[PDB]
Design a protein around this motif. Structure first.
Motif, PDB file in Angstrom:
ATOM      1  N   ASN A  86     -33.505  -3.235   5.141  1.00  0.00           N
ATOM      2  CA  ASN A  86     -34.690  -2.697   4.490  1.00  0.00           C
ATOM      3  C   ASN A  86     -34.500  -1.264   4.012  1.00  0.00           C
ATOM      4  O   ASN A  86     -35.482  -0.610   3.646  1.00  0.00           O
ATOM      5  N   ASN A 121     -34.273  -1.448   9.899  1.00  0.00           N
ATOM      6  CA  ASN A 121     -33.827  -0.305  10.686  1.00  0.00           C
ATOM      7  C   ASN A 121     -34.193  -0.458  12.157  1.00  0.00           C
ATOM      8  O   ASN A 121     -33.437  -0.016  13.027  1.00  0.00           O
ATOM      9  N   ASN A 122     -35.328  -1.095  12.456  1.00  0.00           N
ATOM     10  CA  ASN A 122     -35.674  -1.379  13.846  1.00  0.00           C
ATOM     11  C   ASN A 122     -34.620  -2.266  14.500  1.00  0.00           C
ATOM     12  O   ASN A 122     -34.134  -1.973  15.600  1.00  0.00           O
ATOM     13  N   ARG A 168     -35.441   3.983  15.164  1.00  0.00           N
ATOM     14  CA  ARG A 168     -35.002   3.290  13.962  1.00  0.00           C
ATOM     15  C   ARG A 168     -33.700   3.899  13.456  1.00  0.00           C
ATOM     16  O   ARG A 168     -33.550   5.124  13.429  1.00  0.00           O
TER      17      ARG A 168
END
Lengths: 97, 96, 63, 226, 91, 200, 25, 127
Positions: B39, B66-67, B78
């Motif tokens: 993302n 990113n999580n 993140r």
RNA sequence: GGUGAAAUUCUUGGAUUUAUUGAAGACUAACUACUGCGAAAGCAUUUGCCAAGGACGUUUUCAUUAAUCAAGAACGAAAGUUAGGGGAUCGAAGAUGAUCAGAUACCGUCGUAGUCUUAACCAUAAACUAUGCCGACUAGGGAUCGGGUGGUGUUUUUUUAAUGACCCACUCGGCACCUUACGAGAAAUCAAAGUCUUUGGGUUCUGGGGGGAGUAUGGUCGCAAGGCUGAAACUUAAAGGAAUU
RNA sequence: GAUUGACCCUU
């Protein structure tokens, strides 16, 4: 009193079996309890085989047969005499004739 | 799996987290691989790709945001891009 | 009406709820090995001739 | 039933067979027999255009009748009309489908049925779904009554069958896939690539169906190629 | 910890409007006042401005969503079926 | 006054050095900074404005043109959509299912945005308040509150008057009635509570 | 009477009693 | 030599359809049933009515021109009996005795893989 | 199309039947078995991912950490409830044709709720093996599933090393089965329902003639339907369990 | 697989 050691079905180690609809009355019966039989029959009723052979274009024709499985509920199977009431001692005969 | 190889690189090898550190290491030429989160902004991803093409660095597109990338790296924040400087005990650099 | 002549080759046995009819098997004079299952209202015995107005039907089982 | 219609003319004769005319259906070159029968259509008036009104149709023809062979009597081929050329219209492959009797014959118990399907695309942009059906078989000298598979052998078999079918269809045009499908050689390729996992008899590739089709293709080659 | 047993955010309406209506309002009001994950920056900063408008405070991005949720199940199914049709068209 | 959000989409002018801004009805998922592709060759993506001929069957479309070039008439309210039931290429006509369940045969050239209208589920929330109804209609139009005609005098309505509040005559009014008579249930085929679903 | 129907009848009696007592109180 | 059509036999219960179409199936000939031949509503699936209808369709398709048929037998299928009615055997026998050439007999009764729901309730048809 | 003859029904503005199709929702047939997994409920189309689990193997580690369990909790078929989706089929209600003395039943055709999902409830079933859990010990076997000490026993490759799978000794852990009784039981029957008047391995729950009654009342949980706990007054000589003729 | 519903007195 317990009529059968199998409880009239075939279920040991399951708990639940998905049901099946009877072929005659469409009654829901557990699949293991049904009176399922296999009907494997000639398509030409074995009587018009001569007529079909003489009217066939293709020689040495295979003449296929139809295959299906008829699932009977206990009531319909007894009524149509797929199975019948047996004596108590010979209810234990797992062997077909 | 990619997550297992990334955990092994975390435990044994050397890693940096983040766009700024990743770009600085790409400029110094010390980055051996870069993992980019799914993302990440397309502009930042393309700029990272340009830097990695200039410095002949391999780019791996993580299958997660990113999580998920931060969780795979083992942090509780993140992570958009992670640069692997050396694997040490993993095969992440040798493969792909 | 097209009438066909056939001779009974085996009296299969009496059938019907009241037994008034008998299932027999008949062979046709032409086209050897062509036999048809028919039913009888009266008596029927071995080596008996037969007149059929139509012959494109069979009766297999009765209950 | 003869006279039970309570109403017969709610709103209130030429012979359709006389008004129709016969055509001829011609298979692609990949099959031995070219003529595959005949079909009807209404005569082309100014408002019907019988040519295209009949060009959009398909015919199911037995592979035994296509190839003049006994050992193909349990296969069927869908042929879809693409062109008309003076009462001798030309058809092309749509999909092979097995026969009900044969499938119900090879599906039996005390053995495992394995089914795979793959939707790979050809080199010439035909998208097709191939279905492969295999059956675990009782070996020689075996005394066990059933000889089932073990649900990981089944997964491995499905994996290798999918890989084989993708490899075959990728790189082969529709005509080439038909030409290698008639000799059922892919069945034997699957047999050989599987035999080290389970015996697995009856590897007949089941129906293959055309999901999608490319453009019209009406110019210069099907004369020689069908 | 909890100051109300069941009314929750609908404790502002007091005893009015009926319990059932207050309960439906409670469900949709929790939905419309929640904070949603931003699919673009990955942070739970997506808030509803007005019915259908969902803005992320961090990345400064506005999304068109449902009246009381950032994304409705109808939208999810529609986007899945549009993907299916698109892939079927392409190949 | 609109339950659906609007999208301000900027296009380039193909003939002049100018930016043309258009006001779209936002579909669910459209975001700022997104690229919208409008045209015959545009791809089957949410927010694109393909013709019905270009879209395949089962496509979810919105802001569908009734006639090509009228710039959107059908399925514009929040949460609403049109189903592409089928095509008919000769005398090009696409059959579509409208939000009311109606079948409509329209031209294959009629445009339409892909997806469902944003702001759905709006009527799932109770208003709970004459105040909320007041604010809802304050910026739509002066159609609220509604006095019942049965509560008026006979001068004011067909239903007004009586020593009890009752309609008096049947409330189903003929389609051939006139203005001043058409108060009640106009040209009703049936009345009362119905046991069934829409069934399109 | 079949025990299922006896149980249903007793349920009906119970809820009628509940309604009457609710009205009284 | 032979010109081919498809016999398309549908031997349900209380009726038997015997109607010959072209090889494509889009052009039919002599759509005849046992109902058109029997007066009583209860013999619409009788073997007599099936034979009558098969004779009628064979005669009309000989008037049309097709000499041979491929037989596709079909019971009601789906959630229904899945077994052929009394009429299908008599129908193909009547076609053979009428002298239409026959090739490629196949049963095409629709067999569901996991059907929707059989009618009759869970307790069945209590007759 | 339907039924044991039949008739609300659709139908020459084309019904059913046959195209090539397309959409939707449900389901996962044949394989499918005295077969598998799960604590039960339950679970049967592929790939992937996510975590989990039993059995087996171990000349690994801990060291009694264990068994059963008042309170207290997790899951819990179907039906049902609250909303949002979905809504093909079937179908409590209802509409409707028939047989009928009557038929608001069985049978026929429709058909809302429901059947399918998403959050939240509900917490019941002949939820059954009507058989609590743990541990030990007692005629014998044809078999089967997961492992599987072994037997220079078969096939494509090289019939002349090798990574299959089957066939036979056979341990171990499962689902079950097959003939008197060692025994048990009132019997039906049971390798457990045995090792109980030759009566004690540990432990939990429950019952004390039939009804009244799973009622009243008081709590408590539930949106409700209802769930759990739960009597007395009074009535009663039987009610029941195995089919011996 | 139709319509066969009912039958006041003791061990």
């Amino acid at each position: 009193p317990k009529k059968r050691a199998s409880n009239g079905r075939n279920k040991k180690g399951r708990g639940h079996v998905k049901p099946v609809r009877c072929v005659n009355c469409s009654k829901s019966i557990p699949k293991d309890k049904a009176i399922k039989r296999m009907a494997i029959r000639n398509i030409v009723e074995a009587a018009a085989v001569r007529d079909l052979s003489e009217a066939s274009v293709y020689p040495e024709y295979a003449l296929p047969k139809t295959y299906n499985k008829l699932h009977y509920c206990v009531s319909c199977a007894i009524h149509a005499r797929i199975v019948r009431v047996r004596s108590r001692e010979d209810r234990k005969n797992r062997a077909p004739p | 799996s990619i997550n297992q190889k990334l955990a092994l690189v975390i435990k044994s090898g050397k890693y940096t987290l983040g766009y700024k550190s990743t770009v600085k290491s790409l400029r110094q030429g010390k980055s051996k691989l870069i993992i980019i989160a799914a993302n990440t902004p397309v502009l930042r991803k393309s700029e990272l790709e340009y830097y990695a093409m200039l410095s002949k660095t391999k780019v791996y597109y993580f299958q997660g945001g990113n999580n998920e990338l931060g969780t795979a790296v083992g942090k509780l924040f993140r992570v958009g891009v992670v640069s692997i400087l050396e694997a040490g005990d993993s095969d992440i650099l040798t493969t792909l | 009406t097209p009438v066909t002549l056939a001779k009974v080759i085996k009296v299969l046995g009496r059938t019907g709820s009241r037994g008034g009819v008998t299932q027999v098997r008949v062979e046709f004079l032409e086209d050897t090995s062509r036999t048809i299952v028919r039913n009888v209202k009266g008596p029927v015995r071995e080596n008996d001739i037969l007149v059929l107005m139509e012959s494109e039907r069979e009766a297999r089982r009765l209950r | 039933a003869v006279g039970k219609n309570k109403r017969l003319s709610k709103g209130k004769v030429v012979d359709p067979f006389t008004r129709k005319e016969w055509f001829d259906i011609k298979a692609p070159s990949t099959f031995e027999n070219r003529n595959v029968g005949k079909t009807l259509v209404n005569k082309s008036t100014g408002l019907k255009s019988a040519s295209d009104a009949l060009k959009g149709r398909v015919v199911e023809v037995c592979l035994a009748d296509l190839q003049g062979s006994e050992d193909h009597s349990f296969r069927k081929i869908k042929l879809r009309v693409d062109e008309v050329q003076g009462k001798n219209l030309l058809t092309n492959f749509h999909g092979m489908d097995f026969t009900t009797d044969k499938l119900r014959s090879m599906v039996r118990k005390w053995q495992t049925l394995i089914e795979a399907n793959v939707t790979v695309k050809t080199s010439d942009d035909y998208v097709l779904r191939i279905f492969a059906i295999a059956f675990t078989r009782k070996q020689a000298n075996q005394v066990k009554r059933h000889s089932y598979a073990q649900s990981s052998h089944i997964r491995a078999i499905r994996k290798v069958i999918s890989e084989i079918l993708t490899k075959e269809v990728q790189g082969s045009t529709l005509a080439q896939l038909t030409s290698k499908l008639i000799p059922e050689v892919i069945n034997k390729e699957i047999e050989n690539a599987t035999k080290d996992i389970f015996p697995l008899q009856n590897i007949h590739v089941r129906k293959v169906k055309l999901l999608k089709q490319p453009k019209f293709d009406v110019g210069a080659l099907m004369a020689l190629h069908g | 910890a909890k100051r109300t047993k069941k009314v929750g955010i609908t404790g502002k309406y007091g005893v009015r409007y009926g319990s059932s209506l207050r309960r439906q309002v409670k469900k949709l009001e929790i939905q419309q006042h929640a904070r949603y994950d931003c699919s673009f920056c990955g942070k739970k900063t997506v808030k509803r401005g007005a019915a259908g408008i969902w803005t992320c405070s961090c990345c400064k991005k506005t999304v068109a969503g449902g009246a009381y949720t950032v994304s409705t199940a109808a939208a999810a199914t529609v986007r899945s079926t549009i993907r299916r049709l698109r892939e079927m068209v392409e190949a | 006054g609109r339950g659906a959000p609007l999208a301000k989409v900027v296009f380039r002018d193909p003939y002049k050095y100018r930016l043309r801004e258009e006001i779209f009805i936002a579909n669910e998922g459209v975001h700022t900074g997104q690229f919208i592709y409008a045209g015959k060759k545009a791809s089957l993506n949410v927010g694109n404005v393909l013709p019905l001929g270009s879209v395949p069957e089962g496509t979810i479309v919105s802001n569908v043109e009734e006639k090509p070039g009228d710039r959107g008439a059908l399925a514009r309210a929040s949460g609403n959509y049109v189903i592409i039931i089928g095509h008919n290429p000769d005398e090009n006509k696409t059959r579509v299912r409208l939000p009311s369940g109606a079948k409509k045969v329209i031209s294959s050239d009629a445009r339409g945005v892909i997806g469902v209208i944003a702001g759905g589920g709006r009527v799932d929330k109770p208003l709970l308040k004459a105040g909320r109804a007041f604010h809802k209609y304050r910026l739509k139009r002066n159609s609220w509150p509604k006095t019942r005609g049965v509560a008026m005098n006979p001068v004011d309505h067909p239903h007004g008057g009586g020593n009890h509040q009752h309609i008096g005559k049947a409330s189903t009014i003929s389609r051939g009635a006139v203005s001043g008579q058409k108060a009640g249930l106009i040209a009703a085929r049936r009345t009362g509570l119905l046991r069934g679903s829409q069934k399109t | 009477m079949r025990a299922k129907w006896r149980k249903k009848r007793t349920r009906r009696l119970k809820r009628k009693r509940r309604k009457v007592r609710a009205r009284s109180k | 030599s032979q010109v081919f059509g498809v016999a398309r036999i549908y031997a349900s219960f209380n009726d038997t359809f015997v109607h010959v179409t072209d090889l494509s199936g889009k052009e039919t000939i002599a759509r005849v049933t046992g109902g058109m031949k029997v007066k009583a509503d209860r013999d619409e699936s009788s073997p007599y009515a099936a034979m009558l209808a098969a004779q009628d369709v064979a005669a009309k398709c000989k008037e049309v021109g097709i000499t041979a048929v491929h037989v596709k037998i079909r019971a009601t299928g789906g959630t229904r009996t899945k077994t052929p009615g009394p009429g299908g055997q008599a129908a193909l026998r009547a076609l053979a005795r009428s002298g239409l050439r026959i090739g490629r007999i196949e049963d095409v009764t629709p067999v569901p893989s996991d059907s929707t729901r059989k009618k009759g309730g869970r307790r069945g048809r209590r007759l």
